[PDB]
């Protein structure tokens, strides 16, 4: 199984019909299931992987997410629901041109360190994604002492790290996945160059938006092509769908060329739909699309 | 009675520890505390006028999904709901309000039932001697100005957060119909630019142009002269949300009771100072005896 550590949240995707006491009218709001862990586990589950979400919800409003996990067949064994607490929510204000500004209200995510990654059974692989700060650190420590290889994916939690804690997390990590902005930020905060970050992991994966991705590993760098999206509706969750694809690859022994292409394809499917988890390809569809884009079958 | 037309909304108020000025964009920031409060321009102004012992009749729309807490609060306050319309199968307006270290604010405002505010007709309201038209659904704002003018009810035009929805021609017309205009100093500039009128030109078309200046008080530009209104020192500074509306409540009370502009402005300034010492727009709760005594303390005389 794969252990998916990160936020579990409701996303409120608010649309500003355009692009000091200033208001912006947002006539439409759409509520969606989100959170980094929920999004990545959704992607891995689409592929037929066995995803075990580890994260915290708040009892006040956890139930829809729990019912959705049950409907999807996603195990709830490491999802802790905290009494008298609200679930994390992302207030995602989006304009005309898909740019976004999020106010994230962490709620129960602030207590994510109540879950201990080192107690999880039959975990072969993990990811440590954006979450409560204490929980992110704790999971990297417990997975390393447990000998479970993990992707470190600090994402929106990067500003909670200082130099020392971020360098330590990279030492412990087996892989790192980031976008280019985040790669720069990791470089700046650690005082390490990109070469030096890459030297400390089996692979450093950098997504390049609509232009595919780069996978740097010890003796080479893979350039991963993008896949042309069928329509561009909403980027929220693209990174996470990519990461679901990448983890499926790693767990199933794919080479980096293939793992990266699968991850690129999941990103491209995601962007054609509103919200992080409303794309719903079948595994047969994913295989056919992979062949159409790349000329071979995973 | 005084007809108070404007938004009725629930406010969700968050602080940001930075300054907005120094902060395909994918921007995410942590908001660790949020406080929910009763808000909306009409609810806030009516709350202020009612603190003073005025007879405030709110005119605005709520949504039936979640209106009940606000209707119960109105009833507990003794605020008439005669012109508060609750729209089936609709959500009430919600403001998502973030305040920075300089006390500037950015709001994402989800209008919900506010977009239907023109279902209320201000010209049908009975026993109304004065009114304000504050930020609301655009169609509602324009219709209330038209119907109040047609009915001969003197009103403050208070475009506020609604200003972006107005073009020059509509804003010029609205000022022509209005008896007073109230804006903050940033909004006064926006209005001068949109209309192509100077402040003096705008004041020539109303009985008074009232410009608030935050912690620096207010200016009332009128027929024969201009009053500079001092700020009142706050006892503590907790939240600016609703300061302008408290000020408007004080101003409406003074107008109704025939206060000179110097006194009406000072009362408004006092209400604003009391408001800022409390969270949200309506948690400040002075008594009328308190307001009279504070006014004497601050200003040297009784209103
Ligand atoms: O500060 C944060 N911490 C954790 N999760 C976040 C934060 N901001 C946004 N999201 C979550 O990120 C997902 C997209 O990858 C969204 O679904 C949102 O819920
Ligand atoms: O765009 C808007 N239209 C109408 N009302 C608004 C808007 N933005 C904020 N508020 C309301 O303004 C009050 C403070 O004066 C707040 O209570 C908020 O609900
Ligand atoms: Na990310
Ligand atoms: Na490492
Ligand atoms: Na205002
Ligand atoms: Na006029
Ligand atoms: Na002119």
Q: How far is it, in rounded angstroms, from Cα A57 to Cα A59?
A: 7
B245 is catalytic: yes
The answer to whether B247 is a known ligand-binding residue is no
Strands A51-58 and B26-30 come out as unpaired
3-state secondary structure of B229: strand
Q: How far is it, in rounded angstroms, from Cα A248 to Cα A1?
A: 10
- In degrees rounded to 5, what are phi and psi of residue A80? -100, 135
∠ at Cα B28 (A88, A240), nearest 5°? 70
Task: Indicate left, alpha or beta for B187 from its phi (over 0: left) and psi (-120 to 50: alpha).
Answer: alpha
Chains A & B: contacts with CB separation below 8 Å: 79
Q: How far is it, in rounded angstroms, from Cα A127 to Cα A136?
A: 10
Task: Indicate left, alpha or beta for B53 from its phi (over 0: left) and psi (-120 to 50: alpha).
Answer: left
Q: How far is it, in rounded angstroms, from Cα A282 to Cα A92?
A: 28
Say how many Å lie between the CA of residue A219 and the centre of ligand 4: 16
Say how many Å lie between the CA of residue B36 and the centre of ligand 6: 37
Q: How far is it, in rounded angstroms, from Cα A57 to Cα A9?
A: 8
A102: nearest CB among B27, B95, B106? B27
Write out the H or E segment, with its range, that includes residue A290. helix A283-294
- In degrees rounded to 5, what are phi and psi of residue B19? -115, 135
Dihedral sign, Cα of residue B120, residue B123, residue B126, residue B130 = positive
Integer angstrom CA distances of residue A120 from A1, A79, A152 = 10, 11, 17
Dump the DSSP string for B233-299. Answer: --S-----TTHHHHHHHHHHHHHHTT--HHHHHHHHHHHHHHHHTSSTTT-----HHHHHHHHHHHH
Q: How far is it, in rounded angstroms, from Cα A16 to Cα B176?
A: 31
User: Which ligand has the nearest atom to the CA of B177?
Assistant: 6
- What's the token pair of residue B268? 């408004």
- State how far Cα B204 lies from the chain centre: 23
Q: How far is it, in rounded angstroms, from Cα A298 to Cα A262?
A: 8
Dump the DSSP string for A251-277. Answer: HTT--HHHHHHHHHHHHHHHHTSSSSS
Of A10, A32, A35, A110, the one to substitute when testing ligand 1's pocket (max ligand atoms within 8 A of C-beta) is: A35
Say how many Å lie between the CA of residue A78 and the centre of ligand 1: 19
Give the resolution in Å. 1.7
Q: How far is it, in rounded angstroms, from Cα A3 to Cα A230?
A: 31
Q: How far is it, in rounded angstroms, from Cα B85 to Cα B96?
A: 23
- CA nearest B292: which of B270, B259, B276? B270
Residue of chain B whose Cα is closest to the Cα of A105 = B31
User: Which ligand has the nearest atom to the CA of A196?
Assistant: 4
A27 interfaces chain B, CB cutoff of 8 Å: yes
Q: How far is it, in rounded angstroms, from Cα A126 to Cα A238?
A: 19
The 8-class DSSP code of residue A86 comes to P
A235 interfaces chain B, CB cutoff of 8 Å: yes
Q: How far is it, in rounded angstroms, from Cα A111 to Cα A55?
A: 9
CA distance A178 to chain B (A): 13
Q: How far is it, in rounded angstroms, from Cα B179 to Cα A257?
A: 72
In sequence order, which residues have a C-beta less than 8 Å from that of residue A101 and are 6 or more positions away? A92, A93, B25, B27, B28
Domain edges within chain B: 1-303
Chain A CB contacts of B10 below 8 Å = none
- What's the token pair of residue A209? 């938006």
Task: Indicate left, alpha or beta for A122 from its phi (over 0: left) and psi (-120 to 50: alpha).
Answer: left
3-state secondary structure of B12: strand
CATH, domain range A1-298: 3.40.1190.20
Dump the DSSP string for A122-155. Answer: T--EEEE-S--HHHHHHHHHHHHHHT--EEE--G
Q: How far is it, in rounded angstroms, from Cα A9 to Cα B238?
A: 30
A103 interfaces chain B, CB cutoff of 8 Å: yes
Integer angstrom CA distances of residue B30 from A102, B154, B189 = 8, 46, 33
Beta strands in A59-111 (DSSP E): 75-82, 88-94, 100-105
Any ligand 1 atom below 6 A from CB of A245:
no
Beta strands in chain A (DSSP E): 2-5, 9-15, 21-25, 28-34, 51-58, 75-82, 88-94, 100-105, 125-128, 150-152, 175-179, 203-207, 213-217, 220-224
Dihedral sign, Cα of residue A220, residue A221, residue A224, residue A225 = negative
Chain A CB contacts of B24 below 8 Å = 97-99, 209, 235
Elucidation technique: X-ray
- CA nearest B4: which of B75, B84, B87? B84
When the candidates are 3.40.50.720, 1.10.510.10, 3.40.1190.20, 3.30.70.2190, the CATH number that belongs to B1-303 is 3.40.1190.20
Strand partners, A89: A10, A105
Considering the candidates B66, B245, B260, B292, report the single residue annotated as catalytic.
B245
Radius of gyration (C-alpha) of chain A in whole angstroms: 18
3-state secondary structure of B185: helix
Beta sheet of B34-39, edge-to-edge order: A21-25, B105-110, B93-100, B9-16, B34-39
B29: nearest CB among A103, A110, A209? A103
CB atoms within 10 A of CB A183: 19
- What's the token pair of residue A198? 């890459």
């Amino acid at each position: 199984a794969t252990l998916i550590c990160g936020s579990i949240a409701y996303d409120n995707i608010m649309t500003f019909e355009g692009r000091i006491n200033l208001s912006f009218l947002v006539p439409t709001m759409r509520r969606e299931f989100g959170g980094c862990a929920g999004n990545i586990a959704y992607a891995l589950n689409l592929l037929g992987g066995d995803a075990r979400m580890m994260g915290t919800l708040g009892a006040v409003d956890a139930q829809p997410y729990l019912d959705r996990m049950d409907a999807l067949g996603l195990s709830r064994e490491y999802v802790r629901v905290l009494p008298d607490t609200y679930s994390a929510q992302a207030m995602i204000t989006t304009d005309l041109d898909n740019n976004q500004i999020t106010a994230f209200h962490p709620g129960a995510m602030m207590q994510s360190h109540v879950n201990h990654a080192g107690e999880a059974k039959d975990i072969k692989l993990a990811i440590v994604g954006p979450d409560g700060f204490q929980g992110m650190v704790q999971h990297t420590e417990e997975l390393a002492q447990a000998g479970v290889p993990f992707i470190f994916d600090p994402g929106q939690g990067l500003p909670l790290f200082d130099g020392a804690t971020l360098r330590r997390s990279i030492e412990l990590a087996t892989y790192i996945a980031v976008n280019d902005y985040e790669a720069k930020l990791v470089c700046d905060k650690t005082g390490w160059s990109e070469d030096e970050i890459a030297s400390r992991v089996q692979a450093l994966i950098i997504t390049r938006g609509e232009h595919g991705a780069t996978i740097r590993h010890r003796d080479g760098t893979e350039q991963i092509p993008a896949v042309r999206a069928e329509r561009v509706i909403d980027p929220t969750g693209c990174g996470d769908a990519f990461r679901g694809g990448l983890l499926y690859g790693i767990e199933h022994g794919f080479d980096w060329a293939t793992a990266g292409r699968l991850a690129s394809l999941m990103g491209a499917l995601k962007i054609a739909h509103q919200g992080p988890q409303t794309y719903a390809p079948t595994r047969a569809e994913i295989d056919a699309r992979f062949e159409t884009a790349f000329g071979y079958r995973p």
